[PDB]
Amino acid sequence: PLPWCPHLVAVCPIPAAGLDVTQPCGDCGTIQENWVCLSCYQVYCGRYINGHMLQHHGNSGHPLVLSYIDLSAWCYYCQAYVHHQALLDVKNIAHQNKF
Ligand SMILES: COc1ccccc1CNC(=O)Cn1c(CCC(=O)O)nc2c(Cl)cccc2c1=O
Ligand SMILES: [Zn+2]
Ligand SMILES: [Zn+2]
Ligand SMILES: [Zn+2]
């Protein structure tokens, strides 16, 4: 992954409610291949399901999303995975909730 991207400034604090890696897609309710938005922490499905997270990106401009499958972070603008110390809080909480 990239060690940095200019959109990490948009990563927001984790809700103290925490993360639910089994939360369904906010639009279609699928339990498959969801992503969480690291700006507003809405959960939407990936492009191989119904593409609701890509739609969310298009209608919000929010850049960075985290996979509830493998905890990788995707930037829609950079079209790359990103990993940085700024993502470690969210990844560690997601990992604890998942495993
Ligand atoms: C942990 O990996 C995955 C986890 C679950 C499902 C698929 C993958 C493969 N990884 C991706 O699908 C990453 N990605 C995304 C993610 C956001 C989305 O699915 O909305 N959008 C792209 C888009 Cl929008 C265009 C081109 C490439 C990608 C891309 O590779
Ligand atoms: Zn969906
Ligand atoms: Zn968002
Ligand atoms: Zn970026």
From Swiss-Prot:
Localization: Cytoplasm; Cytoplasm, Cytoskeleton; Nucleus; Perikaryon
UniProt superkingdom: Eukaryota
Binding-site residues for Zn(2+) 3, renumbered to this chain: C37, C40, H56, H62
Binding of Zn(2+) 1, residues: C5, H7, C75, C78
Zinc fingers (UBP-type), renumbered ranges: 3-99
Region (Ubiquitin binding): 46-48, 74-81
Protein residues bound to Zn(2+) 2: C25, C28, C45, H52
Induction comment: (Microbial infection) Up-regulated by the presence of SARS-CoV-2 N protein during viral infection. The SARS-CoV-2 N protein enhances HDAC6 stability during infection by reducing its proteasomal degradation, leading to elevated HDAC6 levels.
Post-translational modification remark: Phosphorylated by AURKA; phosphorylation increases HDAC6-mediated deacetylation of alpha-tubulin and subsequent disassembly of cilia.
Function: Deacetylates a wide range of non-histone substrates. Plays a central role in microtubule-dependent cell motility by mediating deacetylation of tubulin. Required for cilia disassembly via deacetylation of alpha-tubulin. Alpha-tubulin deacetylation results in destabilization of dynamic microtubules. Promotes deacetylation of CTTN, leading to actin polymerization, promotion of autophagosome-lysosome fusion and completion of autophagy. Deacetylates SQSTM1. Deacetylates peroxiredoxins PRDX1 and PRDX2, decreasing their reducing activity.
Subunit structure: Forms a trimeric complex in the nucleus consisting of BANP, HDAC6 and KHDRBS1/SAM68; HDAC6 keeps KHDRBS1 in a deacetylated state which inhibits the inclusion of CD44 alternate exons. The complex is disrupted by MAPK1/MAPK3-mediated phosphorylation of BANP which results in BANP export to the cytoplasm. This facilitates acetylation of KHDRBS1 and CD44 variant exon inclusion. Interacts with SIRT2 (via both phosphorylated, unphosphorylated, active or inactive forms); the interaction is necessary for the complex to interact with alpha-tubulin. (Microbial infection) Interacts with G3BP1; the interaction increases during SARS-CoV-2 infection, promoting the association of G3BP1 with the viral N protein which disrupts stress granule formation and facilitates viral replication.
Domain-related comment: Histone deacetylase domain 1 mediates the E3 ubiquitin-protein ligase activity.
Family: Belongs to the histone deacetylase family. HD type 2 subfamily.
Disease linkage: Chondrodysplasia with platyspondyly, distinctive brachydactyly, hydrocephaly, and microphthalmia: A disease characterized by chondrodysplasia, severe platyspondyly, hydrocephaly, and facial features with microphthalmia. Bone abnormalities include a distinctive metaphyseal cupping of the metacarpals, metatarsals, and phalanges. Affected females show a milder phenotype with small stature, sometimes associated with body asymmetry and mild intellectual disability.
Protein name: Protein deacetylase HDAC6
Source taxonomy: Eukaryota, Metazoa, Chordata, Craniata, Vertebrata
Included stretch of the parent chain: 1109 to 1207 of 1215
